[PDB]
Write a protein that binds this ligand. Structure first.
Ligand SMILES: [Zn+2]
Ligand SMILES: [Zn+2]
Length: 88
């Protein structure tokens, strides 16, 4: 098909977006990564190369990926909302 598209598309990678997520319309894939990096509080080394998160190559760079999310304006102080009761 590879035909045109009439709707919303991810802002991180580009692939069709699932909907409004953290202010930015991200897809299931990207979204997952972001949240994960938060809930897990994982860190990454500064990637000077400043790779470019694209659909064809999404799982290319980690740092850049997480960065792009922040640049777009991904709300980090939102993850904490309606969650299962876990050992506090
Ligand atoms: Zn995406
Ligand atoms: Zn990179």
């Amino acid at each position: 098909g590879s035909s045109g598209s009439s709707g919303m598309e991810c802002r991180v990678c580009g692939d069709k977006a699932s909907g409004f997520h953290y202010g930015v319309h991200a897809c299931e894939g990207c979204k997952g990564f972001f949240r994960r990096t938060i809930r897990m509080k994982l860190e990454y080394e500064k990637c000077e190369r400043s790779c470019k998160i694209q659909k064809k190559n999404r799982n290319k760079c980690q740092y850049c990926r997480f960065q792009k999310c922040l640049a777009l304006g991904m709300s980090h102080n939102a993850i904490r909302f309606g969650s299962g009761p876990s050992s506090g």
